[PDB]
Curated annotation (Swiss-Prot):
PROSITE patterns recorded: C2_PI3K, PI3_4_KINASE_1, PI3_4_KINASE_2, PI3_4_KINASE_3, PI3K_ABD, PI3K_RBD, PIK_HELICAL
Disease: Immunodeficiency 97 with autoinflammation: An autosomal recessive disorder with variable features. Affected individuals have childhood-onset antibody defects, cytopenias, and T lymphocytic pneumonitis and colitis. Some patients may have features of hemophagocytic lymphohistiocytosis.
Tissue: Pancreas, skeletal muscle, liver and heart.
Binding-site residues, ATP: 588-597, 623-631, 720-727
Annotated protein name in UniProt: Phosphatidylinositol 4,5-bisphosphate 3-kinase catalytic subunit gamma isoform
Lineage summary: Eukaryota, Metazoa, Chordata, Craniata, Vertebrata
Amino acid sequence: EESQAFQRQLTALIGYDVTDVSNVHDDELEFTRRGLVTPRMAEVASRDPKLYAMHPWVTSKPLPEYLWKKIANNCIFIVIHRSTTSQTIKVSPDDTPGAILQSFFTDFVLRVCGRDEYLVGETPIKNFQWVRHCLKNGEEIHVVLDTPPDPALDEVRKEVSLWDCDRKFRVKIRGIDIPVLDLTVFVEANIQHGQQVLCQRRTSPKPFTEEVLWNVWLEFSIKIKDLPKGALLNLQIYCGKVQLLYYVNLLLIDHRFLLRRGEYVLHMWQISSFNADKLTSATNPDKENSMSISILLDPIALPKHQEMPNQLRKQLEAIIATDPLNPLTAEDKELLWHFRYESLKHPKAYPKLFSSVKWGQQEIVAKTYQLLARREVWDQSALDVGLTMQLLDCNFSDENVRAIAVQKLESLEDDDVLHYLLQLVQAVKFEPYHDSALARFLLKRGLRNKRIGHFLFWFLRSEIAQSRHYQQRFAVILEAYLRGCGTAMLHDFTQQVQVIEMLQKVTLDIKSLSAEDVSSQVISQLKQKLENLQNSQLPESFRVPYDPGLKAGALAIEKCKVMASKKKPLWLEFKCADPTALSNETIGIIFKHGDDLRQDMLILQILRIMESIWETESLDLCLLPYGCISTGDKIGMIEIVKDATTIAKIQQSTVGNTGAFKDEVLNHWLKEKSPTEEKFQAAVERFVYSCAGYCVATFVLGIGDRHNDNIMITETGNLFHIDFGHIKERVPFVLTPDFLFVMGTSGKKTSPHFQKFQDICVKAYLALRHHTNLLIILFSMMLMTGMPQLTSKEDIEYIRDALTVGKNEEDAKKYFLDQIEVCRDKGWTVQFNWFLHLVL
Ligand SMILES: COc1ncc(Nc2ncc([C@@H](C)N3CCN(S(C)(=O)=O)CC3)cc2-c2nc(C)nc(N)n2)cc1F
């Protein structure tokens, strides 16, 4: 009974009932649940309860040069508090927490004031992110003396060979049936491995009535022994002049290596090119409205495995050197395959090589597995995330290839997993089976670390709530996570979900009262409902989903309001529930219903990756990739950046509601907000840096052409773009006269700052180009897994151009500087055209 009481709880947290079997035709999901018990238990049993409880967040990356020149001679100050009054201590960057706490005593723990963050463990204090964060923002390091939190609070509650068959594969299409609906229609059946169609066959076209039967056998040209694991039977329905209307898939070799035998009635998905959704094995849960198809397959199990010319070498290195979106010809494929063993010596050749394997040919695949047996150089090579990500995309449906990718991820430190976690979670969509090396890796790295675990929960939950194609798989994975994270995390997750459920309701009802124009009489209505839920049943405190170290407390009803938008998001502000906080600042969260926030998360995360890339080359570009977390179906939270205003408003306040935009206004605003000329120029510099990073970052992603109401700036000079969910003469990015004036330029001039801006942009751009392959992959995956409305080849090939693939550096500078100049030329014309468009 209580075990079922625990399952009800799990289900509430996941947002999907995992025990259900109403939408399966096999036991793969249930088999995967039993399969993940072991790796879960293993990781739960092997994790240090102490370090797990305090989750020290640390890095082994070198302290960047920009954070070095902010330390006054190998010394940092660490203010230690107790009851109220605060003693200060001098420390060197290399002092371990215990060493600093030993210095003080002439057992307790150092906790960061206001946060559930801890400076504990065998690493120097220059190696904690909270310290580097305090350094970057020119801030002081305040910590309390505290008891370690009890590990009892994290306690988890204990608990015929296929290769002897030369028969061609065939499938019987009995017919299709739609419940509701004059043209004709046919069924197309594809044997696929990844994006490759191995063999294709159609039925003959019949009239599209609410029931169409065929009773036809489609013999394929492929032999049953030649079926590779992860082969999908992809059934599609066309009509006409031709158009695809429905699709469904079925793994031909199941999870227990058995060939698929018997009667199936598969409920299909509708269409609204390369969408991750097209690859799913999930059938449509909506039995009542959806099309279905009926088929027949006729105990076969699949067995398991055990000096060139100059011209050709060059030709092979030319191929190996190309980008991931450069299509390989048959000549190139045949070359790579013929020179198999020479290509294996180059890690960079792996994606291309494994794309040259004829996967519908049992002996070739065998030789490929032989080849994978001899992977000494790969195993030895340093971790290349870009290369590793390529092997986890839609082009690779073979487990053994994919496993060598995950093999390399094992060596990622917890800092790096957090950088790539979102996209690793999305790559699960390209896995043929519910149980995968990648799925388990995410499981153990999550269970090993509360911060990875926190974000894994939300990322998974976000997909479970707004994707029917993959919710089943992600629900199995998240169930496995929650069954080992511990009772404390379970309580946190419960609190967080409760709060966001309470806020959703208040949002839906507020949206209903308004005419889409936001009256202040409605802002009284909002304040009423917020007060109503404050006493009961809102919880005393909750972790901020996008910043888990922070606990939000009581609402500041006074400061909450309904924002002037057509989605009417809630601007909310909370007090911090932690009294040891030594600030008054509220915690600002925008709560929005109406849009899928996943796209936003993806761009923001790519921005974080771009930052770290730049850190490798000691460049800081002061981007503000603010917190943004999808929390359920078309709902989520966004962090409110403090002391921030839009560029639009700075114009509107001086100039008025008119497009008569003025060059001087921003610099004036910055001058007025800067109290001192030293703080001013620092703000101006921050702006030159910020502006350069957003110019480069948005060019590469093709999101630089924006209305300046979607660009903001802080009172300390920090420019940042907002609201990426959305997405004539154009512009590569936003570099307007107001920005140029702040730098000391107008019309056709240059300055001390402007040349430095051009300097930073060029070095920023080139630095990204040193990771072309990585960025191309994240961009392809982003499109394929997060943006259904923008997934053609030509959409993906934007980034090839943007990154000037194949060109030398010195030319690529010339390319970027032209873009800077294509802005100069246009001044206000596009911003002005944005005013005409959006305001009217
Ligand atoms: C993905 O959806 C969103 N993404 C980002 C934001 N953030 C912001 N959106 C709009 C604004 C400006 C234009 N806003 C207009 C309305 N007024 S009002 C009179 O309704 O209160 C407030 C200012 C600002 C933000 C924003 N975003 C962040 C991250 N920080 C700050 N400070 N602001 C809001 C979203 F709904």
